Structure 1
Amino acid sequence: GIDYDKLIVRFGSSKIDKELINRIERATGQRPHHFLRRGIFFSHRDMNQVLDAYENKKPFYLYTGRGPSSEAMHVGHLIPFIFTKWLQDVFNVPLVIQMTDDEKYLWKDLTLDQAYGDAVENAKDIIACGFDINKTFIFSDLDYMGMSSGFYKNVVKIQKHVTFNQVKGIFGFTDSDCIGKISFPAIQAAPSFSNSFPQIFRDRTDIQCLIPCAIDQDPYFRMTRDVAPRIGYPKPALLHSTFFPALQGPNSSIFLTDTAKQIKTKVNKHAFSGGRDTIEEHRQFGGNCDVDVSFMYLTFFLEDDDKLEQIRKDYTSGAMLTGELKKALIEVLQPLIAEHQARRKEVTDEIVKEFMTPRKLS
């Protein structure tokens, strides 16, 4: 029992209600994604503003990012992108994806070239998620900073309105930290304003931003929202989601690089079970879907609501065993991961380059 209602108030966000979900549905003319109608993406901030702009034929855009990783990207990392891809499709709005290679360089043991390299590679995985090349700008901080007539200006503006004491509290920086880490929050914030991308929005500063993110990141995004009116820009809207369960609750998680046999082995051997120790005692008391990692993953990926609920009931009653549940998950992940690998393999250096080239979108 995690409890997210104690978080909506802890941060001051606005819990998304069955009422808000309906306006989205009416505005998009499509059934709400399962993350919504399942509470994956529960809370938000200013979502109604976005709809106001949209319904009244006024465009808005999406912003999300990732810290280029030299390591593997697991299924958990897909949640944000899947939702953003959906938002992008149903609203048909531009999307900018920031690869914070400068950030990784500042925090990890990498040369500037290696950081950039990890960014271009992670870019393939992101493109693999299926984003439309005609309305998605994926950019490396290291590359785009030197080719934007608006980005650095916004960074300087933000840097002037944020003090060390403020970032010390929000991010825990110390006196021993390099000056690059200390001013980085401005780089991460700048993408929230439309005129940071002249090639896409030009001089416009009204096209509001929408940022899908994790609930426990709301404090960080508060900095950006607080600086917005201070420098004359609309605050970016937010859509919060729950956390992704850890495997145990190496084999730390299921990476998008694992094979069918690897997935199978990870689940059946490491997926934390909320079921009983013996098959006799399990049918006796049932399983706990609340803490059963295997079922939790199903809530994220299994798209059939009925098929999902049926599993919850059976596992809870004790009818379905753990190994059987694990088989239900493995049969959903293998094709998930499999398809990702296929799409990624078809992403050429040409395609990557086009996604990462500042240009007019549609």
Structure 2
Amino acid sequence: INYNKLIKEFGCSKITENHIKRIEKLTNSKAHHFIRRGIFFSHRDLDFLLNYYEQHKCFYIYTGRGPSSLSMHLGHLIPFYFCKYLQEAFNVPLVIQLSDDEKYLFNQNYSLEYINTLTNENVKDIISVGLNPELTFIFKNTEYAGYLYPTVLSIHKKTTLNQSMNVFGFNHSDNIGKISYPSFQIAPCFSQCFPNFLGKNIPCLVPQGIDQDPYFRLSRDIAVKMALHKPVVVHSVFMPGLNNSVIFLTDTPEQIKNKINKYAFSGNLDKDISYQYLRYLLEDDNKLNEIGEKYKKGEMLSGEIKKILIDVLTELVLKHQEKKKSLTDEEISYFFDPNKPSLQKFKN
């Protein structure tokens, strides 16, 4: 996949060192390694957002999760780790949508109950990332649709069937729920969908996988029509693989060791899957650079990098499972309260 080609093809902008310097200046801390290492690499209107934060110290983050399975892996958790950082760095509210409606509509043999099981577990996996419970609002569409609906209607009216089908690749055999859904994913980009804790027309930062862009490329056109702020968009590169070409957060140190040893492509910094995974997982640059140099020059063996990765991954997965098991129902239910005076309520 040619990312630089995609940026210019769909009208995005590369994240620059200036963006980073301004982020560190405004947050009074070091930028996350996702930004420094170009994992989150492209954006729309980030400059506007940074200036708006500088001038008003106010905005909110919005991301989502589609509960189509019980088994999440690290790639799914990448944007949530990132939202955790943004949440703490700027001290702003985070909003997380669970498109249980989408997964119900797109999966023919799935019922709402099943989707809800998947949803609850995915929610616990997401919370287990380390999100600030005070600065977080999670919602299921099946429950928050009433708060989303007037905004959805405006988006509905400004989206022709032609546009929905062209943008999302729908055909005439798809159910009208699939056609109507994208407005519900677009809606939370507008702060009127959260009257309990947010003011009107507050800029929205949307961290997302690249594959989610069609939703928010459309949201920016409709935002102009609705006379509201265009969603500030931030994209991530797809996490590379190498049928269990992934690391599940239910996996054991044993299975992680086996998968890494037997399947992780080795390589060359750019073809070694393990060094990339370390690019994701290692916060300190010195380490990453040392391992990178030793490996590129030949001093370090493959099985070494494999070992260090297995260690890091093992600690991560174990801590995550611990946090997961630690979760009480009240702790989870707290995340669904929009009435927290707490952070949530200060952004007006």
Matched, 1:291 2:271: yes
Q: Are 1:189 and 1:224, in contact at CA under 8 Å, matched by a contact in 2? A: yes
Alpha-carbon distance between aligned partners in 2 of 1:330 and 1:354, rounded to the nearest angstrom? 34
Q: In the TM superposition, what is the alpha-carbon distance from 1:226 to its structure 2 partner?
A: 0.7
**1:284 corresponds to which residue?**
none
Q: Which consecutive residues of structure 2, in runs of 5 or more, have no partner in the other structure?
A: 344-348
Alpha-carbon distance between aligned partners in 2 of 1:338 and 1:3, rounded to the nearest angstrom? 35
Alpha-carbon distance between aligned partners in 1 of 2:100 and 2:2, rounded to the nearest angstrom? 34
Structure 1 counterpart of 2:254, from 236, 256, 261: 261
**2:324 corresponds to which residue?**
344
What is the CA deviation profile of residues 3-29 of structure 1, one whole-angstrom value per residue up to 9, with x for unaligned ones? 532222122111111111101110110
Structure 2 counterpart of 1:356, from 329, 333, 336: 336
Which sits farther off after the overlay, 8-17 or 171-180? 8-17
Q: Are 2:70 and 2:121, in contact at CA under 8 Å, matched by a contact in 1? A: no
Q: In the TM superposition, what is the alpha-carbon distance from 1:70 to its structure 2 partner?
A: 3.0
Aligned pairs for 1:159-174 within 5 A: 159-174=156-171
Q: In the TM superposition, what is the alpha-carbon distance from 1:239 to its structure 2 partner?
A: 1.2
Alpha-carbon distance between aligned partners in 1 of 2:52 and 2:32, rounded to the nearest angstrom? 21
**1:278 corresponds to which residue?**
none
Q: In the TM superposition, what is the alpha-carbon distance from 1:164 to its structure 2 partner?
A: 1.4
What is the CA deviation profile of residues 125-176 of structure 1, one whole-angstrom value per residue up to 9, with x for unaligned ones? 1111111111211000001124x2xx10001110010011112121100000
The residue identity in structure 1 corresponding to 2:210 is: I
Q: Are 2:168 and 2:214, in contact at CA under 8 Å, matched by a contact in 1? A: no
Aligned residues: 341
What is the CA deviation profile of residues 226-254 of structure 1, one whole-angstrom value per residue up to 9, with x for unaligned ones? 1001112111101112121111xx42211
Q: TM-score, normalised by structure 2?
A: 0.95
Q: In the TM superposition, what is the alpha-carbon distance from 1:219 to its structure 2 partner?
A: 3.1
Q: CA RMSD in A?
A: 1.4
Matched, 1:184 2:177: no
Aligned pairs for 1:96-175 within 5 A: 96-108=95-107, 109-146=109-146, 148=147, 151-175=148-172
The residue identity in structure 2 corresponding to 1:268 is: N
The residue identity in structure 2 corresponding to 1:135 is: L
Alpha-carbon distance between aligned partners in 2 of 1:316 and 1:52, rounded to the nearest angstrom? 40
* Larger Rg over CA atoms: 1
SS of the residue corresponding to residue 143 of structure 1 reads helix
Matched, 1:237 2:236: no
Q: Which consecutive residues of structure 1, in runs of 5 or more, have no partner in the other structure?
A: 275-287
Alpha-carbon distance between aligned partners in 2 of 1:58 and 1:3, rounded to the nearest angstrom? 36
Aligned pairs for 1:4-153 within 5 A: 4-108=3-107, 109-146=109-146, 148=147, 151-153=148-150
Structure 1 outlier segments of 4+, above 6 Å: none
**2:311 corresponds to which residue?**
331
Task: Determine what percentage of the aligned residue pairs are the same residue.
Answer: 53
SS of the residue corresponding to residue 134 of structure 1 reads helix
Matched, 1:315 2:315: no
SS of the residue corresponding to residue 306 of structure 1 reads helix
Alpha-carbon distance between aligned partners in 1 of 2:289 and 2:338, rounded to the nearest angstrom? 45
SS of the residue corresponding to residue 42 of structure 1 reads strand
The residue identity in structure 2 corresponding to 1:45 is: R
SS of the residue corresponding to residue 199 of structure 1 reads coil
Q: Are 1:251 and 1:270, in contact at CA under 8 Å, matched by a contact in 2? A: no
Q: In the TM superposition, what is the alpha-carbon distance from 1:216 to its structure 2 partner?
A: 4.0
Alpha-carbon distance between aligned partners in 1 of 2:27 and 2:334, rounded to the nearest angstrom? 28
Matched, 1:215 2:210: yes
The residue identity in structure 2 corresponding to 1:188 is: Q
